[PDB]
Coordinates of C-alpha atoms and ligand atoms in Angstrom, one line a residue:
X1 CA 123.0 70.7 84.3
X2 CA 123.3 74.3 85.6
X3 CA 124.0 77.4 83.3
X4 CA 126.5 80.0 84.3
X5 CA 124.7 83.7 84.4
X6 CA 124.4 85.6 81.2
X7 CA 124.3 88.9 82.9
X8 CA 127.6 90.2 84.2
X9 CA 128.1 93.0 86.7
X10 CA 131.9 93.0 87.7
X11 CA 130.7 93.8 91.5
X12 CA 132.1 90.7 93.2
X13 CA 136.2 89.9 93.6
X14 CA 138.1 87.6 96.3
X15 CA 141.7 88.1 97.0
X16 CA 144.1 85.6 96.2
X17 CA 148.0 85.2 97.1
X18 CA 150.8 84.3 95.0
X19 CA 154.3 84.9 95.1
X20 CA 154.2 87.4 98.0
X21 CA 151.6 89.2 95.9
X22 CA 147.7 89.4 96.5
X23 CA 145.3 90.1 93.2
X24 CA 141.5 89.9 92.7
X25 CA 139.5 86.9 90.8
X26 CA 136.2 88.2 90.0
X27 CA 133.3 86.0 89.9
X28 CA 129.7 86.3 89.1
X29 CA 126.8 84.3 91.1
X30 CA 123.1 84.0 90.7
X31 CA 120.3 82.1 92.2
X32 CA 119.7 78.8 90.3
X33 CA 123.0 79.5 88.3
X34 CA 126.3 78.0 88.6
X35 CA 129.0 80.6 89.7
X36 CA 131.1 81.9 86.9
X37 CA 134.7 82.7 88.3
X38 CA 136.5 84.6 85.6
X39 CA 140.1 84.1 84.8
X40 CA 142.9 86.4 83.9
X41 CA 146.6 86.9 83.5
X42 CA 146.8 88.1 87.0
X43 CA 148.8 84.8 88.5
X44 CA 150.9 85.4 85.5
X45 CA 151.6 89.0 86.5
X46 CA 152.3 87.9 90.1
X47 CA 155.4 86.1 88.8
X48 CA 157.3 89.2 87.7
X49 CA 157.5 91.0 91.1
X50 CA 156.5 91.2 94.6
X51 CA 154.7 93.4 96.9
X52 CA 152.1 94.1 94.6
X53 CA 148.5 94.6 95.8
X54 CA 145.0 93.9 93.9
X55 CA 145.0 97.3 92.4
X56 CA 148.6 97.3 90.8
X57 CA 147.5 93.9 88.8
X58 CA 146.3 94.3 84.9
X59 CA 143.1 93.0 86.0
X60 CA 140.9 94.7 89.0
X61 CA 137.6 96.2 89.5
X62 CA 136.8 99.8 89.7
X63 CA 134.0 101.9 92.1
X64 CA 133.3 103.9 89.2
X65 CA 131.1 101.9 87.2
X66 CA 128.0 102.5 85.5
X67 CA 125.6 101.3 87.9
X68 CA 128.3 100.0 90.7
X69 CA 131.7 98.6 90.3
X70 CA 133.1 97.8 86.8
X71 CA 135.7 95.9 85.3
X72 CA 139.0 97.7 85.0
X73 CA 141.6 96.3 82.8
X74 CA 144.9 98.3 82.9
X75 CA 147.8 96.9 80.6
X76 CA 151.0 97.0 83.0
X77 CA 154.6 97.2 82.6
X78 CA 156.2 94.0 84.4
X79 CA 158.8 93.9 87.0
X80 CA 162.2 93.7 86.5
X81 CA 162.0 90.0 85.7
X82 CA 159.3 90.5 83.3
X83 CA 161.6 91.7 80.6
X84 CA 164.3 89.5 80.9
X85 CA 162.3 86.5 80.4
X86 CA 160.6 88.5 77.4
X87 CA 157.3 89.4 79.1
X88 CA 158.0 93.1 79.1
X89 CA 154.1 94.2 79.6
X90 CA 150.9 92.5 80.6
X91 CA 147.7 93.0 78.9
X92 CA 144.8 93.9 81.2
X93 CA 142.5 91.0 80.6
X94 CA 139.3 89.0 81.6
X95 CA 137.9 85.9 79.9
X96 CA 135.9 82.7 80.5
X97 CA 138.2 79.6 81.0
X98 CA 141.5 79.3 82.6
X99 CA 145.2 80.5 83.3
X100 CA 147.9 77.7 83.3
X101 CA 150.9 79.4 85.3
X102 CA 152.9 76.5 83.9
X103 CA 152.8 78.4 80.5
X104 CA 152.7 82.2 81.5
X105 CA 156.5 82.4 80.9
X106 CA 157.2 80.2 78.0
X107 CA 154.1 80.2 75.8
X108 CA 151.6 83.3 76.6
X109 CA 149.1 82.3 74.1
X110 CA 148.8 79.0 75.6
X111 CA 148.6 80.0 79.0
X112 CA 145.2 81.7 78.4
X113 CA 142.5 79.2 77.7
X114 CA 139.3 80.1 76.4
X115 CA 135.8 78.2 77.2
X116 CA 133.2 77.0 79.7
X117 CA 130.3 74.3 79.2
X118 CA 127.3 76.3 77.5
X119 CA 123.9 75.1 76.9
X120 CA 122.5 77.8 74.8
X121 CA 123.0 79.2 71.4
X122 CA 124.6 83.1 71.9
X123 CA 123.3 85.6 69.4
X124 CA 125.1 88.9 70.7
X125 CA 127.4 90.3 73.3
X126 CA 126.2 93.6 74.6
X127 CA 127.9 96.1 77.1
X128 CA 129.3 99.2 78.0
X129 CA 132.9 100.4 77.6
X130 CA 135.2 103.6 78.0
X131 CA 139.0 103.4 76.5
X132 CA 142.0 105.4 76.9
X133 CA 145.5 104.3 74.9
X134 CA 148.8 104.9 77.2
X135 CA 151.1 107.1 76.3
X136 CA 154.0 104.8 75.3
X137 CA 153.3 101.7 73.3
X138 CA 155.8 98.9 73.9
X139 CA 156.9 97.1 70.5
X140 CA 160.0 95.4 69.9
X141 CA 162.8 97.1 71.8
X142 CA 161.1 100.5 71.4
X143 CA 158.6 102.8 73.1
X144 CA 156.5 104.7 70.5
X145 CA 153.4 107.1 70.1
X146 CA 151.6 104.4 68.3
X147 CA 148.0 104.4 69.4
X148 CA 147.1 101.4 71.4
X149 CA 143.8 99.3 70.7
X150 CA 141.9 97.2 72.9
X151 CA 139.9 93.9 71.8
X152 CA 136.5 92.3 72.8
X153 CA 135.1 89.0 71.3
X154 CA 133.4 86.0 72.2
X155 CA 133.6 82.3 71.0
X156 CA 131.1 79.3 70.7
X157 CA 132.5 76.2 69.6
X158 CA 132.1 72.1 69.8
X159 CA 134.2 70.3 71.9
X160 CA 135.7 66.9 70.7
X161 CA 137.8 64.2 72.6
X162 CA 141.1 65.8 71.8
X163 CA 139.8 69.5 71.6
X164 CA 138.2 70.5 75.1
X165 CA 139.7 74.3 75.3
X166 CA 140.9 76.8 73.0
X167 CA 143.7 79.3 73.6
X168 CA 145.0 82.7 72.8
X169 CA 146.2 81.5 69.2
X170 CA 142.5 81.9 68.0
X171 CA 142.8 85.7 67.9
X172 CA 146.3 85.5 66.0
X173 CA 144.4 83.4 63.3
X174 CA 141.3 85.3 62.0
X175 CA 139.2 83.2 64.7
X176 CA 139.6 80.0 62.8
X177 CA 139.6 76.8 64.1
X178 CA 138.2 73.3 63.0
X179 CA 135.5 73.4 66.1
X180 CA 134.6 76.9 65.9
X181 CA 131.2 77.5 65.4
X182 CA 130.3 81.2 65.9
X183 CA 132.4 84.3 66.9
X184 CA 131.5 87.9 67.8
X185 CA 133.9 90.3 67.1
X186 CA 134.2 94.1 67.9
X187 CA 135.1 96.4 65.1
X188 CA 134.7 100.2 66.7
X189 CA 137.4 100.4 69.1
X190 CA 137.7 104.2 69.7
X191 CA 138.7 105.9 72.7
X192 CA 136.2 107.6 75.2
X193 CA 135.7 108.8 78.4
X194 CA 131.9 108.4 78.3
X195 CA 130.0 105.0 78.8
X196 CA 129.7 103.5 75.1
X197 CA 127.4 100.9 74.1
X198 CA 128.7 97.8 72.0
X199 CA 126.4 95.0 70.3
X200 CA 128.4 92.4 68.7
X201 CA 126.3 89.8 66.6
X202 CA 127.4 86.0 66.7
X203 CA 128.5 85.1 63.2
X204 CA 127.4 81.5 62.4
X205 CA 127.3 81.8 58.7
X206 CA 131.2 82.4 58.3
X207 CA 131.7 78.9 59.8
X208 CA 128.8 76.7 58.2
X209 CA 128.4 74.4 61.1
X210 CA 125.3 72.3 62.0
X211 CA 124.3 72.5 65.9
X212 CA 123.6 69.2 67.5
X213 CA 120.7 69.8 69.7
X214 CA 121.4 66.8 71.9
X215 CA 125.2 67.5 72.1
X216 CA 124.3 71.1 73.1
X217 CA 122.2 69.8 76.1
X218 CA 124.7 67.1 76.9
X219 CA 127.2 69.9 77.5
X220 CA 129.6 69.6 74.3
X221 CA 129.8 73.1 73.6
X222 CA 131.9 75.7 75.1
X223 CA 131.6 79.6 75.1
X224 CA 133.8 82.2 75.9
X225 CA 134.1 86.0 76.3
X226 CA 137.4 87.4 76.0
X227 CA 138.5 91.1 77.1
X228 CA 141.5 93.1 76.7
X229 CA 142.9 96.4 77.0
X230 CA 145.6 95.8 74.4
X231 CA 144.7 93.8 71.2
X232 CA 148.3 93.0 70.7
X233 CA 149.4 92.6 74.3
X234 CA 149.3 88.8 74.0
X235 CA 152.5 89.2 72.1
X236 CA 153.7 92.1 74.0
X237 CA 152.7 94.8 71.8
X238 CA 150.7 97.4 73.8
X239 CA 151.1 100.5 76.0
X240 CA 151.5 100.6 79.6
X241 CA 148.3 102.4 81.2
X242 CA 146.0 101.7 78.6
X243 CA 142.8 101.4 80.3
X244 CA 139.7 99.5 79.1
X245 CA 136.7 99.9 81.5
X246 CA 133.5 97.5 81.2
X247 CA 130.4 97.3 82.7
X248 CA 127.0 95.6 82.6
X249 CA 128.1 92.9 80.1
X250 CA 125.3 90.4 78.9
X251 CA 125.8 87.3 76.6
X252 CA 122.1 87.6 74.9
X253 CA 121.2 83.9 73.6
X254 CA 118.8 82.3 71.8
Ligands
LIG301 NA1 128.7 96.6 87.5

């Protein structure tokens, strides 16, 4: 049993081809730890057009980070086909888990699967952000000056035989689920061009669960971190151009 890293730097990417496009998959490797390979909706975005390079995608990295490179989440307008299949935008996102491309077009919420095996009890998610909403908010068949907001949260839950992963419905249901143990959700979400610290405490008291120390050691608990430039971009309410930069993210554990 090796733990994933708990400190995330956003330095590293590999380039992956799909549908005549290429995009980045971010990963974090540390000595004595299992490499975390982040997921995002980038493969879903690859379906909506051709000739995209990594920096056209909703999820990429920037060299203008606080320490070195940083996460760059930019909500994107989709290519011709996206609209016609009801995918007018694609939120700049990053999460722990996986992206099911079989669901990207029919059920966006199901496509983003959240979780990886975690042996610790997390207490807080700390990191730094910058955020600027895009100028036109897409909602319904309309483009408005509604001010887009971003989301940051983390999940800690108990696995069961028929519940191995959660998905995007968790953020549409007040973070409620029968397997849920703790959740950390950002509340202050203001725009800024200055690196701004966040510190989200995990709330175990809201769910009233009892941790099994054995099952925790046996790998029966998953954690996830989910980041998005557009809070409601999962249901295609968001602004193209909405940019969330994240750097020096750490899952502080017990
Ligand atoms: Na960094």
